Design a protein around this ligand. Structure first.
Ligand code: CL
Ligand code: CL
Ligand code: MG
Ligand code: MG
Ligand code: MG
Ligand code: MG
Lengths: 384, 384, 384, 384
């Protein structure tokens, strides 16, 4: 068996998505997500100008050899751009392998471990009354788990947000108190701190949120120095999640082996595909850590299909984020996965069950969109 | 899909082997090794009286769910008997899954990572001259790696050996000096200490063996207290291997994460099958540890086939032990794996490529054989 | 002195019990429990097919030599099946040694350290009102210590239970609040978490239970990774117990030496007998850990007699679990130990004071019964 | 002051170089290296499609604010592609700031700390005789420090090398013995292991090289798991260097703070520019670590000029690698730095003293060239 062609498709049906398609000499093809929000074209070049020319002629069944060849062979290791490119290749090859086996991908990984996959959605409001309404709307859509974000009183190219830590820490516990009073204890509640605190501030916030029994408090502090979480863990029993921005097991080995976190959020598209995320999830399982894949709209339906197959098998599954794609996004990527009453199943189609409609994708050209930056009230460039 | 039957076959074509066969409602079947040397019938009962009745009617594609069901569901966790029974089930189910995919098993794991699999053999002699001759005979059979064991001057139910640590430590370095003088530096040399030393004795021996640059020094001290290896590692750069007797990742997590060993020897048949050994090997890979599967004759050809498929894929492969089965053993277990000039390939037959000839197996009834014990010169019951 | 015979008796007077009887050439005999709930026949084979043939002709007075011979000589070390078989031998030999000395067993261990042995019983209800009634019934039977378990609102082969961690954590503290309000502070209250939490969940629960001053919170998290308890210990002063499922000191050395637990629950029948439990209890004593032997109905009266003799001597005794055997069970195993007003004494008969009525045991053939498994609400196979 | 334009120039005068030029509204401009060997065009896109559009209109004097804006604002942090793009911006802005100050760049950093900057060159041979000749040729060019690499007996798209660790470890100490015998003890000798060993192999090699007193042994093991170096450091006093492949302080914080290495090799072009390398070098200085910047031909003369200015100031300077550019490369990048008798000075021109001749650069179009991969003798994809 040989790879005869590989191509990168770029489309913007509401937001930018980048997709790799690998075609074999037997006409079976596979696809993988390569989208890196706000830096998309750097991955397109990494693939087109460097990795795709090496793929041609190789045996697509050698998933591990090709993963190692690109991971080690880049010489400069890890990193968002190269690991997203490698993820796209790895997912497309697992898609091919499952189609050659005539099995849905979850069967190749070890089969199903559960009948349904818990998800969570968003509830965002500019103030408390609107936040409470957004939680009602999320519950009415059948979600059993809801991430709550609320505006704080007094608070093509990157937008610039302004931030006050002190105002946020003083107000946000009152939001969770009000949500618990209105909606009761059974609903799972999540909160994303979005990198804005120092560890002793995160320790304070985790303690203040303990009475509300959150499913997790996410991304509390920037995590390049993984020891940052030791101080948080010493002060609170609010569960901790981190890692949507990671691209390697080396970004989280210490967080996990020291039991400093409860959920690892690192994704298939951003951390080298199914081959690497199997290793992260298995390492996590030794230390009570569960998967909580990031699932914002900037991960394409191809990533979602691969993630749901992974979620259906992995023993230490925690939850799957679901920020829904629009109708126009979904039409470009026909898929077998489905949602019902707060939960997903991956679908029984062979492969990860996702395809790309190339004719439709071609109707929507790339349009640049970058992520915001965040400044403190004095103008300091902070963490967004 | 359903399991319709499962049975345990016991045969003694020169030594005892126990094999599980699982049969599906589509007539595809899979087999797994269940042999536990010197306690064989305890596994037969564990399977026949407890696990097989639960398997019937289950979907064999759910490998992970069934692994967890038995691993956790036994309540009393881990252990040689239960983990060998679970290994037999797990291997038979991966054999079925690969046959359903119409692929050799290594393809399901991620594909081949190498063209050939390095093995090692034995060279044993009662004295130095005979040891040197045994090394020549091993080299003439095409082996590139040879385990050297030599008798020490002055040294149905279990045989009782006698042991002197001091005589062994004084003599064994001279054996490796003589082997290097006769055979040169290119041949890989291994030594199995077989549990007989304390850590400071193993540190001394490792230092004394450094000039001879061994591939490994194996099982230097009993390893129930994994911190025993820290003191060895602080004193020698001879590479260290351990773990043929282990049955769980929990027997070696600290040895590996602290970089106290170089090779993990734990096997598919004795540690819960391919599902658990994938997790051990991947954990090992984060810490520079390589696989060195045990491969004595008491692991059946079914274990060897599964091991060779695993070895063909796993990135951090080190070596495969090969103590050859006899012609009568091989005839009971037709297999696709082959040996050439010191190396193996697993074969391209779907599954792990091994089968059992039930009619032939029935010609050789069980015959008890137990492992020796070892006593010190004063009669103390020691480690064999 | 020589062992002339040894036999395994299997009986099901309401539930399965396995018993070893060793007979000496002077006609003195000893018995030991060999019951391993839900895997019973695997121990029968381990004994009959491997260990008993080695016992014959040996001097029964050599308890330590025989313990080492089997512990080390199995080659594959530790584990539920082999350690239960070895426990049966070790207890039967201590029973013989005490009969040869013409002493109750506790005298051989070092004599009595207390006049009475505190026990605890069960109080289980499907809801809070019924739980409160079960606590009244337990108190009326004279118990001074009561384990409380309550159903949670909204929650031959293994039964399958369903589990929600979040519902349990939200409700269970209210059960202990109600029990304290009704029964006051003097009664000792225990709770068994039964392996269902992660460490930060157990930390949360321990904190929530602090106002109710439990004697212990038991088996909070699966303990194969012993470092799991470090995080619990950093967050709560509720006392911690673990270890009914352990079979070796190596399962708990780190829990004890780091002062991560308060009570070790590992038993004579499941962890290699009196010889090994003397070593566990003495190690525990250096680190303030007290014995809290498991004492569910699946440990036979032979185990109970040995445990009570051990409990009467050991300095760092904490408590003895007592889930009562039925009248039919007790009739098969005449014994000297007695209960009075919440406490036991072991009895003054030589040996451990327990015997087996072989004629009566023969009236009740083995009947398979396995332990349940537990699944999460999505179907994930969890810890029961 | 404002940035009015910024552009990326790509040229291949013998090998590919990528250069950023930032132009201010006062006509002062600055340049920075953006070359990432073997992935060059991914950086071109990162700059052109994402970062340059944000630069336009910003005040170039705000070097720190712009560094933080891009480092944090990318959201996905660190990594070879983004950190090389950010390095190009940071160096071009320091070039502008020094030109506005009318000072050579080293004056802005704190002034000169030394009169001359020690460098090292290459001596490579296919065998020992040729290696010895290459060392003579290097000495005759005035170098006082020489990296020695020798072939080992029996050993557009990526070339595939083959590797044997055992043959290398057996032979390489003899090469250093011969070099010391011929050239004496005063010459500084370096060796690059190039990622090929495990830590205990590197410990062995470091010990074997101790009699030859190397300046350093470099890149002994892949360093994603920084604790890998602890075991090397416990066994040898050969000095250790690592880090040409790093892009962040987070790749080396533990190596440095634990005193596991002697020289940090991370470069201005690959790790976020002068702003980040000032922080790495200062952190290193607290722990006795000295700078040893990588200086292979794939770092352009723009990187060399910035590095030499940095080297002239930094207190804890160790050495500068110098693998010489060709005449055609040098003509595209006129520069003030000069070499004399083994040492450099950075030159007294304002800025880093390097410029790009755009007309000449335009004569040499991009031509793809990728780095080799390395396979073991069995075909395993290894570290190159
Ligand atoms: Cl990158
Ligand atoms: Cl066992
Ligand atoms: Mg987030
Ligand atoms: Mg061995
Ligand atoms: Mg319990
Ligand atoms: Mg180098």
């Amino acid at each position: 068996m040989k790879i005869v062609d590989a191509k990168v498709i770029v489309t913007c049906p509401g937001r930018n998505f980048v997709t790799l398609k690998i075609v074999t000499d037997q006409g079976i093809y596979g696809i993988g997500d390569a989208t890196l929000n706000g830096r998309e074209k750097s991955v397109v070049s990494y693939l087109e100008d460097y990795l795709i020319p090496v793929l041609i002629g190789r045996d697509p069944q050698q998933i591990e050899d090709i993963w190692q060849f690109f991971y080690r062979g880049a010489y400069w290791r890890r990193g968002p751009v190269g690991m997203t490119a490698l993820a796209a290749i790895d997912v497309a090859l697992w898609d091919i392998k499952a189609k050659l086996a005539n099995m849905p991908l979850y069967q190749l990984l070890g089969g199903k471990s559960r009948e349904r996959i818990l998800s969570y959605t968003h509830a965002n409001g500019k103030d408390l009354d609107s936040t409470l309404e957004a939680v009602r709307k999320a519950k009415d859509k059948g979600y059993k788990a809801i991430r709550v974000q609320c505006g704080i009183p007094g608070i093509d190219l990157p937008s610039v947000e302004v931030w006050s830590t002190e105002k946020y820490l003083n107000y946000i516990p009152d939001v969770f108190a009000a949500v618990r009073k209105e909606f009761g204890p059974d609903i799972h509640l999540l909160h994303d701190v979005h990198h804005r605190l120092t560890p002793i501030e995160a320790a304070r916030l985790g303690k203040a949120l303990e009475p509300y029994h959150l499913f997790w408090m996410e991304d509390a502090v920037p995590a390049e120095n993984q020891e940052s979480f030791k101080l948080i863990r010493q002060h609170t029993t609010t569960p901790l999640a981190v890692g949507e921005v990671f691209n390697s097991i080396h970004d989280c080995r210490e967080l996990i082996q020291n039991q400093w976190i409860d959920y690892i959020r690192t994704t298939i598209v951003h951390a080298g595909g199914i081959s690497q995320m199997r290793r992260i999830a298995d390492f996590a399982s030794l230390f009570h850590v569960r998967t909580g894949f990031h699932g914002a709209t900037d991960l394409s339906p191809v990533c979602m299909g691969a993630a749901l197959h992974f979620d259906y098998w992995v023993p230490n599954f925690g939850i799957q984020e679901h920020m829904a794609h629009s109708e126009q996004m979904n039409a470009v990527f026909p898929h077998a996965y489905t949602f019902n009453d707060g939960y997903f199943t991956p679908g029984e189609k062979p492969g990860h069950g996702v395809d790309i409609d190339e004719k439709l994708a071609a109707q929507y050209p790339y349009k640049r969109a970058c992520l915001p930056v965040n400044r403190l009230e004095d103008g300091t460039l902070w963490h967004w």
